[PDB]
Amino acid sequence: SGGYFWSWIRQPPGKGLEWIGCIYYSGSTNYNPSLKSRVTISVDTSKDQFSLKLSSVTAADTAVYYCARQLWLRGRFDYWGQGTLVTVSSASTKGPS
Amino acid sequence: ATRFASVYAWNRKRISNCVADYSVLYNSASFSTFKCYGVSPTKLNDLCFTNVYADSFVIRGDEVRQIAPGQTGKIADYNYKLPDDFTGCVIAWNSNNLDSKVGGNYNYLYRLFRKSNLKPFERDISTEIYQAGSTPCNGVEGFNCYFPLQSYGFQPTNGVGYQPYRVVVLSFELLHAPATVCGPKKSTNLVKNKCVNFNFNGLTGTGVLTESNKKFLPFQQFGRDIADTTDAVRDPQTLEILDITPCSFGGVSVITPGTNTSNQVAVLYQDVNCWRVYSTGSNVFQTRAGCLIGAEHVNNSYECDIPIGAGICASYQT
Amino acid sequence: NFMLTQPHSVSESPGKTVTISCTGSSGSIASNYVQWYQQRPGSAPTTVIYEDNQRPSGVPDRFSGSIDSSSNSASLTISGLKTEDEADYYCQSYDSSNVVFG
Amino acid sequence: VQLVESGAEVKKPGSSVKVSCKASGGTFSSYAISWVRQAPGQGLEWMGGIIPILGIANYAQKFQGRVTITADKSTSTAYMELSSLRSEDTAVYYCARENGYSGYGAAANFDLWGRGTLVTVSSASTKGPSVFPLAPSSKSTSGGTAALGCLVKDYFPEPVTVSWNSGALTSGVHTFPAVLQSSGLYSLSSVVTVPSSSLGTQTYICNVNHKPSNTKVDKKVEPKSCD
Amino acid sequence: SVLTQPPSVSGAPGQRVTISCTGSSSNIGAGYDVHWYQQLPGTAPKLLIYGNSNRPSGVPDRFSGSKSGTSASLAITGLQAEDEADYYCQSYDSSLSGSVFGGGTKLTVLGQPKAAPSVTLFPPSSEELQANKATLVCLISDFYPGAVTVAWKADSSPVKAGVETTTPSKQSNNKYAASSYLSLTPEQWKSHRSYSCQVTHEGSTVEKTVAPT
């Protein structure tokens, strides 16, 4: 409802923000040309959520990922989500002491 | 459109008697300019306009940035000038599959030279040769005498700044008239004699809907009183005039002697000549400033602690 | 090939004004609007100035914005600085099927 | 000035034409030239606009693949060419000079118009006219005057004049326009009133000239002997 | 295209006539000016009114036009004997991207003491049987073009083949004259007894039948 554009925004630590891709309430998707052929965002209306799928993750992809609603296609990312930390590392999770 | 008119003669079409679905306009993801001065594109689905004007022409990349209200150049000065208070915005996109053929498309002619600055929303079609010096130019094309219309070079392999961009200019007008063009928003049922907030043709207010016997001229749409507030509503779905009764109309003064000091307050009604009151209460006293309830009255004359008006003073005693 | 260029670090004394400039690389800046964001460390960025100079609710009047098509740059002016103004600042614009940042 | 054009032309249904509009008494100096047709019994129809300085042209959306217009800035002549002629293309074609002005609406107007060239299509070729002598009968001659004339059959095109005694008669003459037929043939008539006393002393002859057919025959009209 | 006007109007020299010219949103309602063109019967149209108020030199002041809303109005104060002409309103269209003219208003001011028609039947001569044709004519004069009827009968069955109507031409004494031609064959020319031309005008019928034999 509302015809609002849901998008994803990432930012490396200490660096600038990077825009990943945008979606509509339908299946129409827009992607950044630099990171094309690696992102697949979909909308699950039944669960009321939109996700992201990144393939061939490199070591430079460690960044804080954001999801933001857009009131307008070329408008402001008015409402933001909390910054989640995703780190690229071969080591598995170990228990604290 | 199958073809677009030139710059010196831009075709303008009036849009009315329809709902303007802008959701297929600002969500096309194929245009190149949507700087909309004044109103916002998110509010275009809510506002209602008297009429919508849509100009159109084809311009190059270097001149698509100078169709703002306050700008100068060879286009804003001579070809198309927007007013400083312009409402709406231009829309431009790349036109390379169309309007781009080999050998140059010299069909369009922009005004390179003109005698004076162009007035806003004015179309100038004139081919008289512009002179520069004191020499006469009665139809001649000699020195210091050039054709005011200069052709455009539009090649498929031309530079990006010289590529032909199809420009369409949407302009909105807000006049004292019924709005025949509105957003795609629907309309609910009409209620009467109830304090209900309303959304009438883009005007939002809270009040009581009551029938009005006043005769309303078809030219006007809204009725304003001396207080410059909304009083009349056309209601275009049913085309009947309703008087907007305010939910609160009288003056109420609450004589509160503090919160922790005392929990007893007095209500003074300015428009009531002691009913349309909060409560009847007791010790009703009528003063020159109005009717006061909840406060006692005495024949003594003490110092004025809490003034009421017109020489009336009230205080909290034992 | 559109990107936005801004200075990496601009500092000023409190009580005076400061101008932050965001300049486009190839395309114009007078189209597809501009957006300004302020990112406090350890938190999501928040909108500060959107559109030409529009400001959302909850943003002080000190944040003033202006455009300059001739210089191909977007300017954000802050007057009367404070401790809470120490954060990263970003400029955002829209391009064909992609949104650019700084 | 005066924007004179060429004469009337008759073309085949499926051929191409070429008319001109020559500016006399001056030139259309930096003024655009437009063309307007007028079908018989219909309103004016816009063909296209040419500004002779830049040599560019545009056409209406009704027709773009069958009309091409050109102009000459030096000799001051603008031309048409209408290929793929149909049966509905019969009209009078005017050359017009656009006169622009500044304003809010600023609609183009054509103040100076041409003299009009008639263009028509006919599958039937030019044929030699046949002139038929018509004489009144005894019943038709009741008073002091008789109605006598000549009838022309199978003549092409329409503008063919009929002269009475090589112009010697100017009173009582009448010109009757022809009518279209199923085969596209035209047939006009002409009848004059002459006194019965002059029938036996003065003769009447009809001289019909055909400019495209290059023929001019002489025929004798005599009263009927039976009636 | 869409510049519809009333097909014909009427008036008197002592009154006023208003010619309406309506269009659409993209040609008249958008704000484009209208242009009036008076076409006299036999010459080229001339610019009557341009800019909705301006009069070119030569045009008398009696020709005044106006534009309001999505319509155009042309008014004539004095109607003389030369104002009988077709009037077309011209403006600029945005969808067609070209100038559009009006449908045409037949402004006719006339009145005459019409009289009874006088018809004449001329039988074909004897030099058409060898030509394999039968030029059957019906000369009608002193008649008006308001009611022209061409009927051919043989007193056994009416002839519906070869019957046609022609526009009458003005004479030199303010009268109209015309002639109708009937196509037949010499083989059937002598087979039928009669071929009568019937002309009816305002309920008045004159019938004269020729005798070929």
Numbering used by the authors:
A (entry chain H): 31 to 127
B (entry chain C): 344 to 617, 633 to 676
C (entry chain L): 1 to 102
D (entry chain D): 2 to 228
E (entry chain E): 2 to 214
Copy text verbatim from the article accompanying this structure deposition:
During the first 3 years of the pandemic, the spike (S) protein on the virus surface has been actively undergoing antigenic drift generating a large number of variants. Being a highly dynamic protein, SARS-CoV-2 S-protein has been observed to adopt RBD “up” and “down” conformations. Our structural study reveals that interactions between the VL6-57-encoded mAbs and RBD are mainly mediated by germline gene encoded residues in HCDR3 and LCDR1, while germline gene encoded LCDR3 residues support HCDR3 in antigen binding. We provide evidence to suggest that the identified class of antibodies constitute a potential immune pressure driving the genesis of S371L/F-S373P-S375F mutations in Omicron variants.
Notably, H18 exhibits detectable cross-reactivities with RBDs of SARS-CoV-1, Bat CoV RaTG13, and Pangolin CoV GD1, with affinities ranging between 134–332 nM. H18 has mild neutralization activity towards wildtype, Alpha, Beta and Delta SARS-CoV-2 authentic viruses, it also possesses activity to trigger conformational change of SARS-CoV-2 S and exhibits inhibition activity in the S-protein-ACE2 interaction mediated cell-cell membrane fusion assay. When paired with other RBD-specific antibodies, binding of antibodies to cryptic epitopes may also result in spike inactivation by promoting S-trimer disassembly. Similar S-trimer disassembly has been observed previously in the presence of mAb-R1-3216,56. Consistent with our expectation, the R104 residue within the “WLRG” motif is interacting with Y94 within the LCDR3 “QSYDSS” motif via a cation-π interaction.
